[PDB]
Design a protein around this ligand. Structure first.
Ligand SMILES: *[C@@H]1O[C@H](CO)[C@@H](O[C@@H]2O[C@H](CO)[C@@H](O)[C@H](O)[C@H]2NC(C)=O)[C@H](O)[C@H]1NC(C)=O
Ligand code: NAG
Ligand code: NAG
Ligand code: ZN
Ligand code: ZN
Ligand code: ZN
Ligand code: ZN
Length: 264
């Protein structure tokens, strides 16, 4: 996800963290603001744009080597790779935030990374190798020449909401929260975190990856890529996927809240 998506996942998480957990994260982040998690949700993307951070680019995704749309599957040892992936990064930093030998700012870095990666994992193209996670699939959306990946990360979410300011993410999170507590997602919500255990970060994260990867075959490119490079994707393709985007942003937020609560 782009900026709006990351901030939204964070605001949703802020709603579900216990009051005690919310004070430990605020202490660790050195900020007691109303946007304590949301304001740093995109830090990892800014970091990879620096020479110091270039090494971390591969942590934002897992290139599942499957065969969409026929067969979608994730395999940790087959797909993670030599330079790490989102799954190994979840394990690394879950352990580092609560390590007593590390420094305060080592803890702040780990938390900032967790806030980000738990969200990135729900974007289906972040769990798929094909065409470089869809970046090579050139398409037309709303009259513009984008690529599949950027449409899922940024353009479709912004088409729905209308902007990427923190205030936009705050309002989107509000509707999502309503739906989880008293709406369409209420019955589903518990299944999003069922089984998640901080003492089993690899098994847990692989589960999150498989859940998102399955959508590549059924929703992202159910009829191959050639079917997507031929007309404008709005409104027909847009209409068929926008419900899934909201669902994935909500899962990220709910899972992040529960992860922080368990760690605390
Ligand atoms: C676990 O997290 C640490 C902290 O971010 C990673 O350490 C960085 O590793 C890169 C590449 O080796 C170095 O260039 C950085 O300078 C390191 N930073 C620090 C603060 O140590 C570490 O590589 C991560 N390990 C895994 C397996 O992902
Ligand atoms: C995709 O890439 C090539 C190069 O731009 C182009 O010839 C083809 O028509 C493209 N598809 C669209 C939708 O541009
Ligand atoms: C988490 O993992 C350990 C097993 O290693 C277990 O004792 C604990 O009950 C597990 N389940 C939850 C929900 O924490
Ligand atoms: Zn992202
Ligand atoms: Zn992306
Ligand atoms: Zn990212
Ligand atoms: Zn509530």
């Amino acid at each position: 996800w782009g900026a709006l998506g990351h901030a939204t996942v964070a605001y949703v998480a802020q709603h579900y963290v216990s009051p005690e957990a919310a004070s430990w994260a605020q202490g660790i982040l050195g900020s007691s603001s109303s946007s304590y998690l949301a304001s740093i949700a995109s830090w990892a993307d800014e970091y990879r744009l620096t020479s110091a951070g270039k090494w971390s680019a591969s942590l934002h995704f897992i290139d599942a080597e499957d065969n969409p749309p026929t067969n979608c599957n994730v395999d940790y040892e087959r797909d993670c790779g030599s330079s790490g992936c989102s799954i190994s990064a979840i394990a690394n930093y879950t352990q580092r935030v609560s390590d007593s030998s590390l420094s305060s700012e080592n803890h702040a870095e780990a938390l900032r990374f967790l806030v980000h990666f738990i969200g990135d994992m729900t974007q289906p193209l972040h769990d798929e190798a094909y065409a470089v996670g869809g970046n090579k699939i050139n398409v037309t959306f709303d009259g513009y020449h984008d690529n599949l990946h950027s449409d899922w990360d940024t353009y479709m979410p912004q088409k729905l909401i209308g902007g990427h300011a923190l205030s936009d993410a705050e309002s989107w999170a509000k509707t999502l929260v309503q739906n989880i507590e008293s709406g369409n997602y209420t019955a589903q919500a518990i299944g999003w975190i069922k089984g998640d255990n901080i003492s089993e970060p690899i098994t847990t994260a692989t589960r999150w990856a498989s859940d998102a990867n399955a959508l590549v075959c059924t929703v992202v490119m159910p009829h191959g890529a050639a079917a997507l490079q031929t007309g404008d994707l709005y409104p027909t393709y847009y209409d068929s996927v926008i419900d899934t985007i909201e669902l994935q942003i909500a899962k990220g937020g709910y899972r992040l809240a529960n992860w922080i609560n368990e760690i605390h």
